[PDB]
Design an enzyme around this catalytic site. Structure first.
Site, PDB file in Angstrom:
ATOM      1  CG  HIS A  12      -1.973  -1.139   1.122  1.00 19.47           C
ATOM      2  ND1 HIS A  12      -2.950  -1.319   0.148  1.00 19.47           N
ATOM      3  CD2 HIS A  12      -2.135  -2.150   1.985  1.00 19.47           C
ATOM      4  CE1 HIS A  12      -3.647  -2.418   0.421  1.00 19.47           C
ATOM      5  NE2 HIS A  12      -3.185  -2.931   1.555  1.00 19.47           N
ATOM      6  CE  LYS A  41      -4.877  -7.104  -2.090  1.00 20.24           C
ATOM      7  NZ  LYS A  41      -4.272  -5.928  -1.420  1.00 20.24           N
ATOM      8  CG  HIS A 119      -6.660  -4.105   7.106  1.00 19.06           C
ATOM      9  ND1 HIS A 119      -7.015  -5.022   6.133  1.00 19.06           N
ATOM     10  CD2 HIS A 119      -7.784  -3.381   7.352  1.00 19.06           C
ATOM     11  CE1 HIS A 119      -8.282  -4.816   5.775  1.00 19.06           C
ATOM     12  NE2 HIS A 119      -8.762  -3.822   6.500  1.00 19.06           N
ATOM     13  CG  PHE A 120      -5.704   0.634   2.456  1.00 22.49           C
ATOM     14  CD1 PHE A 120      -6.923   0.664   1.804  1.00 22.49           C
ATOM     15  CD2 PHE A 120      -4.991   1.814   2.573  1.00 22.49           C
ATOM     16  CE1 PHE A 120      -7.376   1.832   1.205  1.00 22.49           C
ATOM     17  CE2 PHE A 120      -5.465   2.986   2.012  1.00 22.49           C
ATOM     18  CZ  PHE A 120      -6.652   2.997   1.320  1.00 22.49           C
ATOM     19  CG  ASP A 121     -11.262  -0.950   7.117  1.00 20.97           C
ATOM     20  OD1 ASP A 121     -11.157  -2.158   7.284  1.00 20.97           O
ATOM     21  OD2 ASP A 121     -12.318  -0.314   7.282  1.00 20.97           O
TER      22      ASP A 121
END
Length: 124
Positions: A12, A41, A119-121
């Site tokens: 990210h 992905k 984590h990228f939400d």
């Protein structure tokens, strides 16, 4: 095993550019970060700010994560991001993406010591 913090940076963070310059940035970035290894992905976001600025989000606007945990944080500022989304025709192993540059707030889950994004939400 890769730390969740390092995985976040791999998936990210792209502190190089201020934006996406070309329309195949995603095709190239999704490859070089090992996100078209085994499968394509489908969706992934790159953040075009300093690591420091992204890490600082962990001390900003606390919010629920999509999974209902409460260790997520929304960036107070908009950030330069690039949304990569696989095309409808894309077929592994020739993974194809649209690149959409935007300035949006990011939502990240933070954990650990140092307390950093794991984590990228979402982006909002």
């Amino acid at each position: 095993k890769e730390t969740a913090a390092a995985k976040f940076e791999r998936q990210h963070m792209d502190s190089s550019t201020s934006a996406a310059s070309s329309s195949n940035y995603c095709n190239q970035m999704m490859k070089s970060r090992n996100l078209t290894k085994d499968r394509c992905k489908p969706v992934n976001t790159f953040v075009h700010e300093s690591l420091a600025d992204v890490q600082a989000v962990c001390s900003q606007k606390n919010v629920a994560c999509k999974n209902g945990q409460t260790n997520c944080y929304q960036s107070y500022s908009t950030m330069s991001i690039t949304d990569c989304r696989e095309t409808g025709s894309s077929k592994y192993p020739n993974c194809a993406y649209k690149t959409t540059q935007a300035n949006k707030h990011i939502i990240v889950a933070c954990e650990g010591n140092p307390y950093v994004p794991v984590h990228f939400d979402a982006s909002v």
